[PDB]
Amino acid sequence: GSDGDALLKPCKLGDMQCLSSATEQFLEKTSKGIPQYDIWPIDPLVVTSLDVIAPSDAGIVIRFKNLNITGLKNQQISDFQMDTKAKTVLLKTKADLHIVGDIVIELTEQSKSFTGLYTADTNVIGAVRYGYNLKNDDNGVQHFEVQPETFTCESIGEPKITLSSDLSSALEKDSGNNSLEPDMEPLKTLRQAAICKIAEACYISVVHNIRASAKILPASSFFENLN
Numbered sequence: 001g002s003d004g005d006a007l008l009k010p011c012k013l014g015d016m017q018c019l020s021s022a023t024e025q026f027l028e029k030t031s032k033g034i035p036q037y038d039i040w041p042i043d044p045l046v047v048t049s050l051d052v053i054a055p056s057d058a059g060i061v062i063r064f065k066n067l068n069i070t071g072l073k074n075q076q077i078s079d080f081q082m083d084t085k086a087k088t089v090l091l092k093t094k095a096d097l098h099i100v101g102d103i104v105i106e107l108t109e110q111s112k113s114f115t116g117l118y119t120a121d122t123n124v125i126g127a128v129r130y131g132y133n134l135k136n137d138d139n140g141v142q143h144f145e146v147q148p149e150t151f152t153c154e155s156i157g158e159p160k161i162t163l164s165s166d167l168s169s170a171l172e173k174d175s176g177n178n179s180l181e182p183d184m185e186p187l188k189t190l191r192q193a194a195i196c197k198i199a200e201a202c203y204i205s206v207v208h209n210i211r212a213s214a215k216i217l218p219a220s221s222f223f224e225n226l227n
């Protein structure tokens with residue numbers, strides 16, 4: 001990652017150009033993850049495993065493994081709302097996410113299981129709501145209180161699903177589509193629950209990074225003035 005000449009800087013409130021630029025840059029640096037700042041990587045982002053249930057029949061269970069998600073550290077903030085009167089910050093991010101890893105299709109109703117490769121590429125637009133407060137740490141420095149954020153999926157643009165020739169063929173042949181339909185289920189979840197779930201997993205990493213960082217730097221570090 002050829003990005004180490006910057007990580008975080010003071011921005012003005014209401015400036016979607018400064019704030020957004022900060023989240024993009026900071027995320028870009030932490031994208032590699034560094035144990036020196038208690039920051040985990042998120043680009044590329046590998047998932048040792050990712051289970052997801054399908055409401056289609058409450059029996060289809062898709063368990064992904066070693067999922068490679070790239071194209072997030074360079075995301076773009078779609079919207080953001082900062083309220084001091086309520087100390088709340090709701091901002092949504094959108095960017096082309098590329099997932100590449102394993103996928104296990106365990107049918108509880110059909111009493112079967114499958115394993116293959118899963119490759120998806122599409123834009124993921126999700127909204128996150130988290131509170132923000134200002135309190136002096138145990139040293140006397142006004143730190144930044146990062147409340148528990150909340151994931152809120154919005155859209156996924158054009159979900160481009162791409163399963164291995166063995167898996168994709170095993171599904172289309174198991175359902176009778178012969179072309180594995182996108183909205184035929186469990187495929188429906190492979191583009192909805194899959195994308196959404198993945199986004200959440202990554203959101204936890206990015207959030208944690210900022211949390212630990214706020215412990216090393218004050219609030220002013222993020223905004224030129226928050227009081």
Ligand SMILES: COC(=O)/C=C(\C)CC/C=C(\C)CC[C@H]1OC1(C)C
Nearest residue numbers: 019022023132144145146210214222
């Ligand atoms: C999802 O993106 C962010 O949280 C980052 C933004 C809006 C730009 C940089 C500013 C912060 C991380 C400060 C937000 C506030 O939650 C604290 C306490 C970190």
